[PDB]
Write a protein that binds this ligand. Structure first.
Ligand SMILES: [Zn+2]
Ligand SMILES: [Zn+2]
Ligand SMILES: [Zn+2]
Length: 178
């Protein structure tokens, strides 16, 4: 196994996957690394199994159909994995915890949103469809773009949204387009 957390790239108290060489901090893995379970298989491995069990699941899909899916166990897992892929980028630090808004010339968003709030919402099974998770994730970056206006810091929202969107298209096998 690797000697650093796959998510935050630091050492520490690491749980090792039994079926691949990745390792994780307890609360860096999503869901949080399970108490017992020997062997234990990481989210990466669980996602790869879904694909291997249903190879056709990799055929292209329309985004509108994916969004309307109910949050059955496989879709719950796919959203958890997508969330984890965003935390894998170090720039997610800006979006992880609860924001506050006091900048001359700007007003805070009407509906603040942040990664740890989406993480709790997934853990608490608050989303009934994929659409609820995706809308909160896109709202994080939209709020950031609107608040920061012409400040160059706006770019951090574009960057992390691009990580989200690329991983959304990969994990949910969205049909490739020009
Ligand atoms: Zn970590
Ligand atoms: Zn694994
Ligand atoms: Zn099948």
């Amino acid at each position: 196994n690797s000697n650093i957390c796959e998510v935050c790239n630091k050492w520490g108290r690491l749980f090792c996957c039994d079926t691949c060489p990745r390792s994780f901090h307890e609360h860096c893995h999503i869901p949080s690394v399970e108490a017992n379970k020997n062997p234990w298989s990481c989210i990466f491995c669980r996602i790869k199994t879904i694909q291997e069990r249903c190879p056709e699941s990799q055929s292209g899909h329309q985004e509108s159909e994916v969004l309307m899916r109910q949050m059955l166990p496989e879709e719950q897992l796919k959203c958890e994995f997508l969330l984890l892929k965003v935390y894998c980028d170090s720039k997610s630090c800006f979006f992880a915890s609860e924001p506050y808004y006091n900048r001359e010339g700007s007003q805070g968003p009407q509906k603040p949103m942040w990664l740890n709030k989406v993480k709790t919402s997934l853990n608490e099974q608050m989303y009934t469809r994929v659409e609820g998770f995706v809308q909160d994730m896109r709202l994080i970056f939209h709020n950031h773009k609107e608040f920061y206006r012409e400040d160059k810091f706006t770019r951090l929202g574009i960057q992390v949204q691009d990580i989200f969107e690329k991983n959304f298209r990969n994990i949910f096998a969205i049909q490739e387009t020009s």
